[PDB]
Amino acid sequence: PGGVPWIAVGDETSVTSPGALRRMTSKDIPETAIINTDNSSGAVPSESALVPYIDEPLVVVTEHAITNFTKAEMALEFNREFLDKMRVLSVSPKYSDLLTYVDCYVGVSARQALNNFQKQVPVITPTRQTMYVDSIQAALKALEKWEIDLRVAQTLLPTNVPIGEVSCPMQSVVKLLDDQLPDDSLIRRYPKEAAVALAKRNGGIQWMDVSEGTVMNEAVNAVAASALAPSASAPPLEEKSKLTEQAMDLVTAAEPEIIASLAPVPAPVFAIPPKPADYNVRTLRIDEATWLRMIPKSMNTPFQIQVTDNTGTNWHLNLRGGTRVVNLDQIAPMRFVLDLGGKSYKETSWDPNGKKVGFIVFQSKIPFELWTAASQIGQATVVNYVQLYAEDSSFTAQSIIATTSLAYNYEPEQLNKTDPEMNYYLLATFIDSAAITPTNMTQPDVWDALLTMSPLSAGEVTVKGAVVSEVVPADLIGSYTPESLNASLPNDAARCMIDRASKIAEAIKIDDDAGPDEYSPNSVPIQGQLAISQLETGYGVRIFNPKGILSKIASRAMQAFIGDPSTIITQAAPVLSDKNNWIALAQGVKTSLRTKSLSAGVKTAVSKLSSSESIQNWTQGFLDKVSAHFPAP
Amino acid sequence: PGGVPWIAVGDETSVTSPGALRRMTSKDIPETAIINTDNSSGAVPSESALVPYIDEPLVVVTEHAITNFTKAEMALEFNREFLDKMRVLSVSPKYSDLLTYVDCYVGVSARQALNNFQKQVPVITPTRQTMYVDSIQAALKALEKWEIDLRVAQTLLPTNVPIGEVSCPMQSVVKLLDDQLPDDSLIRRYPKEAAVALAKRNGGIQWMDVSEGTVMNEAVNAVAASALAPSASAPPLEEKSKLTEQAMDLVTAAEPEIIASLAPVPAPVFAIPPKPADYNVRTLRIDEATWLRMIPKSMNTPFQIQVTDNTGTNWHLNLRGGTRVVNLDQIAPMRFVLDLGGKSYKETSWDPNGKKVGFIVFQSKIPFELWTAASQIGQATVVNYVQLYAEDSSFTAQSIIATTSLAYNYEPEQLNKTDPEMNYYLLATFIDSAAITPTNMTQPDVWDALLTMSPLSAGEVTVKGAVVSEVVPADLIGSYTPESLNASLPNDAARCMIDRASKIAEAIKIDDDAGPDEYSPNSVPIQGQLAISQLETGYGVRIFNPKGILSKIASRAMQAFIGDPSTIITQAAPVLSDKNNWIALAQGVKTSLRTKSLSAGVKTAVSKLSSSESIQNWTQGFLDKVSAHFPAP
Amino acid sequence: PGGVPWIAVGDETSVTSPGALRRMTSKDIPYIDEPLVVVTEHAITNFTKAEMALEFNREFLDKMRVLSVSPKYSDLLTYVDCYVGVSARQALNNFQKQVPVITPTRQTMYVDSIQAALKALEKWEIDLRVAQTLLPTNVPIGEVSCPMQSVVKLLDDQLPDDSLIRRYPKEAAVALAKRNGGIQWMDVSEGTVMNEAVNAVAASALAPSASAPPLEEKSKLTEQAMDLVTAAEPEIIASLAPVPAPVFAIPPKPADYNVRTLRIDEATWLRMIPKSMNTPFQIQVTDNTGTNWHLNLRGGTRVVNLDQIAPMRFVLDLGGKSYKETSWDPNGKKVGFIVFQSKIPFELWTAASQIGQATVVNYVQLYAEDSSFTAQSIIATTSLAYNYEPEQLNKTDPEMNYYLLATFIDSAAITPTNMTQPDVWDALLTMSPLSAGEVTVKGAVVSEVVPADLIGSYTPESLNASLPNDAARCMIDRASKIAEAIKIDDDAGPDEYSPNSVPIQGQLAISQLETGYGVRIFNPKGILSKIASRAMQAFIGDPSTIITQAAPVLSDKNNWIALAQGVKTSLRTKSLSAGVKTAVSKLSSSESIQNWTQGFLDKVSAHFPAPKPDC
Amino acid sequence: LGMRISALQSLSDTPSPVQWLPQYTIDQAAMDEGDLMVSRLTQLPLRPDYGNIW
Amino acid sequence: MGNASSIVQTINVTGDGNVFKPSAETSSTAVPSLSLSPGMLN
Amino acid sequence: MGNASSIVQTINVTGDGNVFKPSAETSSTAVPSLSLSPGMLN
């Protein structure tokens, strides 16, 4: 049982009797006190002035703990000879010698204890537990160099074979080790003890008693090695079990109910840690990108405006037809980096050397396209800016801007969003300390560069460029085009769906080995859905297809999904644009992976056996080479 | 034992065939019925009209389930005080009072069960098990807000120190916790219950008793703490076990035997979920990319052709010298996306704005080089097309093309493939409803744009640009020059092998901590091979090196593998190109990992202890701050 | 117990005695003698479960005339009283009665028998899996129904032509009934039907309740989060004391640079001859095979410095560049790497006397093609490769200086007036580390690093010009795992306090109450809660914010240490629980999926109609 | 009872022993126990007829 | 452990005499996970 | 295996009659990891 032991205080007893129990303490049981333990290890002092007397609590050790700590003792008993040489822990610890057996009420709380009464419950005091674990840890600390050296000795030459059997004259092996052993190795200093430890760990190494002349297997771990070895016609049992476990854990990692729900799901429950994205504004279109604004090109009357920064130094700017801005509102907190490397921006009367390029933020009621006069800008601020520098380029008589990294952190909370009639705009442009003559500069902005966007809040989600409070995953299937996908924000719902489905793709891969156009346990649900759906009433010309053609179609569809997961969200995708097919696959994966019974494919079995034979042959050949040199006298 | 119980069919204790056994039910054991439940939880109705009376089966409960559900109930018992406060589940479920002990036959099938008679096995019905699970689950459901607030209280200030002990007056902690804890929290409403729960969870918190005076440790989880605690010379036990198990899982996932096979291995068993790749088709060199074709250069007779898509619309286009196409045979399914953003294609005699670019597919028995005068074109149709747009460019007096995502899916199954003579080609170029005069448009094609290919299958593997049915993993080592690696297809075998070996590299780095030029158990397998190989006789001058030089070279080899995992593929690699070294390392990793005995490295342990002591010092400083700014009375 | 059994050779025994113990063999039980091994309980239970995994398919195994008798592992174990242990000392200290023992031969035969049966059952197993998966047979929550005759009609309709169910339908029916308790077959002789499943405990573990998620999912998610955080190693990345480089480093990744476009002041691993020299000169260098190549140096030439760089591999690509001049043509030319080593610093070089010992390590031939622009030609893709391994050089003398240059080469002397381009560094370079145990800071190798001082020190440009083996990238890749674990373990929305964001709040409150230089300010608890929430959200959305300079809250050190400790102290104290919003969303989604399954079963019943009632 | 329903087909007795081709299942046993059972069931020693070798 | 004022209580949260001694050997733990795999439960 | 020294009183490392016969069934193992999860110990 688990929990602590309790003792009666009042005579009355019931499953809910008030105040009837009290914690049992070592004052009741003298055998638990540290003055009444057995110092077979030598931890408690023998001087009566060094052994304290303070009353101490009691806990209960569970059978799990007993088994695992005895396994911990076994972890030291392998290296007993070297511990003997170092004169450390002469008497091996025994855990059951620190447990006191008593019968009482056992439970975590008093109410649970009132209904529980066991006999031969084993209890310990915390200090005895700490002393035992400290002894084990000291023994482990003593054996670090020895363990590394023994692992080196085992790993120097092939000692294990995947299948079958090999053999070599042990004299040649010993000579090879003598020739390749490290100088500082404890294996040379203490040979016999290394030999005994190796005989314990492995069953191929065998030594004879020269007195009686007998040789036999002396490994102590036959039971586990039986499960590690591959029997005929089938891979090792533990490998199959572990691969199935890993696949099931991948499936559980991405919850299938969230990714195949037909009803709204909150944004935080759906979100995952995102990844950055890179864009170029000039190459982007206004129609596809829903977060861009442009002054209509028909203006042809640029105007110069002044704006102050946070410190109080004015700047000059020029706006004209075509000047592009990013519409900040309706987007989560975001991080922008502008990189102007590899660009010239060189004009007849404009030299990029020494010029300053910076971000500005405008806050105005008037929509951006209606902007003609200066006073319509409202409020503006130069958040950040950097000085430029040009170097000569590969092309003749050309120059390129060096590498720059300009940063901005859009945080809506630092702004006040109470007034709805308010527009927030972001610009990146040239700034000067004097007037910029419009005749001098003809570029609308500096937005023809690289722009890195990285999300700054993993709890909000956007669709097609606008924040949504809740998302319906089933309706995202088959509703995106590449033009609408590459121009999405970094925290889009499309990318979350792709990354949550990649785990399902890997899981399906692990347990399948089918080729092109072969039915599998995972490819049948789509076939069933197709077979049912083709018989349903619709509007077009109905088509009848047999069983084999449908099985081929389902196999191809599943393979296409595995190879490129994003196809489940692409418009006009062949089979994976029907949300019924996606839901069927997602639900059937769990059933397929739960009913496996320690099995593998036929192809995997045959390939594993063939490969094991090949490495067996290779190892035998290497040992023949080793025996040719370093010969046995 | 597990399964179901079985009883005789009434025979006089003479059961000599599996035909004389029938499965036990609740009529044969009346104590397992629904009406005999003790109903201490109040779940079963007391009205006699509502309790059903029907025959249910029986199943056997195993010790694993008993212990795990028994610990599940103690999970609830950690919060008995608040559960009392809400009058919920006043009596502990006590799983052991639901089972019934019967001497019967135990098994899954009658043939096995006949030869296995057991005494005192515990059985239960499905209904009572479901009721018990429901009771625990409801009790857990009623504690969500309370547990969250308790965790917030614990994590507001550090209550755990990595090593050693810290201290602070509790009055200061209570003042800080009153000042900072949220108003919504249930801690403010129910203080004493939270205090008792925290004293149970944490052994540090101790509450003095007003009536008596004794203050003592009262936590119920000391054994787990000692399993987590670090000794003053070694790290904790559990962390070492967890790290080694994770490394073993990575090695198991990497399939060390598949990537070391000396015999052919089928493509579906070797493959993994692939990744897309990007290219520039114009910039590739034809002798490196074996999957391109090009019409001979210096040809001085451009010709024009016409072609119609699946809607019958006619289109004009022209082929000239230098035009390139892509073989669409023997490359497996693949998806192409082409993007022209950032390129000009501007001449005085032709402007791209308003024009259309398309993918055109050709079928013909004549090689693409021997094409002219449109008589050799063969059957051909337009697949897809898109319209361009022009924007201002950074370079003065130039303009650039806006983004595109021209897509096409190639699925080899649909096309007939009837005549092996037949050849398939793909091309991207300008098309227009008016014939394009050769003088105006001189560009051979529009292949000067970014091209992304993504595989459409997971059981297809190519080499150097042609698909194969099987691969020999030991024959890919040291067989790729760097130029042949940037021109392979995304479904190449080299990428699969590199990704599989990356897991071995990660496992080795997780397990091993060695500095520059230091021997490790994971680097001697190369050393033994180097020694034996340098002894042998081949052709050329022999060089003999001692053990120190060989150890240094082996260590450098292992480091170069870990840092960059694609050196095994690379041709003319110094030491890792040889297949023997790769096979020996891959085989030795498993043996090196499997024979650790709860250990770590010296450097790791010492650095870890120093770090933990620094952490306790910082924690103590913070607690001094807290006790100094919140004075006790 | 475990290990092996032993027998006392003599009457005299004690806790620590010389001799006194020999190993038991097959002679000592009541010719070939084999050793004995003590069998634990874990093995017995797991092997029994493995046997019943075969026993699910007894009817098929009996139709095919295989496996007439079951394995029954508990026959092979022999019970005996003896000393037990791995070594003689442990055996001397122990003594147990009725321990089970077995010889290796019998264990191997047993496991081989199980494996043979599992090999013979494989196609049958795959066939039953196909039959179960073809139509929805499980639902997340609730209960759905469908007539059985329609289901069997659909199965007969769509099952493969070689499926083994079509040969053994009754055996397949019984097997499905054993696996799934939903599929029940009426007993004809008596007219009674009821559940005949043998798996009813795991079914309860995997089943949702009326209002709460399944227990198994909660336990699995918590274990996964703890495993991720444990792998992240919080103690190493929270250290305020130096930690060795091999411990801190984790496998690195390549990086892509442009050498010409970089600025000299940010990137300290570059050296450029001053532009005021104004005159060129030409030199002749001999490669490893004795070939002579002439190359020209001038002002503005840039070289990578190889002194304080870890073993690194450079691969260079020139694709897309023009390099076409009035009197030079890139087609047919050659470009290569040169490694200089000299005792004279680069900036002082004026004549061929200063070039030191030089060698053309690698070289390629340039091929040019027409480009998108009119009358413009660009170069094809190249992969120039070099492996800087320092230990192959003479690093014993300290005065030596090493440099790396990439430029045009030719067998004839290059006329200075034809080509005025300094080098070919205006091209895409990919650098990849070769040593996973050495780390650099800001462009110089460091013996040990302090994780508590890297945070809040890099400007964006400095982080750009970092080498692939920088300690900052190790810090980022070691904090990303903590970020992922927190995201798995949390569902807090905007401005919602969570047990994972409050340590920062406590640190902020304490720091606010302290006295320091500046204009003192005060805040309530609500403002601090919001500030902590924004800081944690920004961390999760961008793990690279701890190292970025002038960060809002995460540039500080105390906040980072507090968060790193809070992750562990919060994950360790859960009780099989889940968030409120997560629970309600799971319930609603499961009910929707149940409705969709029921609708599909209605469609299945509409087609493949069942026989009408007889009377 | 699990049995097919069918009546026996009568046959007359063969006056000499008949050939028998055995077929092996996947069951296995140790060689020593096989030799032991062969020793138990055997009818040796005996004196047979020799016949002619040429 | 938040503030609460009362006349007489069995344990006083804001009183003097308590102990706040966080240690590595005591630590804090609950029941976060259990072994409930389908194969092992049976 | 031990090297550069021979001792024959009990086990001669360099003597005759020793067996080196690696096999798949015998394999080689130690105690790599255990079950020390906090929820299972208690």
Residue numbers in the entry:
A (entry chain F), B (entry chain B): 43 to 675
C (entry chain H): 43 to 72, 95 to 679
D (entry chain J): 377 to 430
E (entry chain A), F (entry chain D): 1 to 42
What text comes from the article?
MRV is a prototypical member of the Reoviridae family of segmented double-stranded RNA (dsRNA) viruses, which is further divided into two subfamilies based on the presence or absence of turrets on the inner capsids: turreted (Spinareovirinae, including MRV) and nonturreted (Sedoreovirinae, including bluetongue virus (BTV) and the life-threatening rotavirus). MRV capsids are composed of two concentric protein layers, encapsulating 10 dsRNA segments. The outer layer of MRV consists of the protection protein σ3, membrane penetration protein μ1, and spike protein σ1. The inner layer consists of proteins λ1, σ2, and turret protein λ223.
Meanwhile, the outer shell particle, consisting of the outer layer proteins μ1, σ3, and λ2, appears to be a byproduct of MRV assembly. The outer shell particle appears to be a byproduct of assembly, as it lacks any inner layer proteins or RNA genome. This notion is supported by our single-particle analyses of viral isolates (described below), which show a much higher percentage of outer shell particles in the late infection stage as compared to the early infection stage. Analysis of total particle abundance from the two-time points shows that the proportion of single-layered particles decreases between the 6 and 48 h post-infection points (4.1% vs 1.3%), while the proportion of outer shell particles increases dramatically during that time (0.5% vs 22.5%).
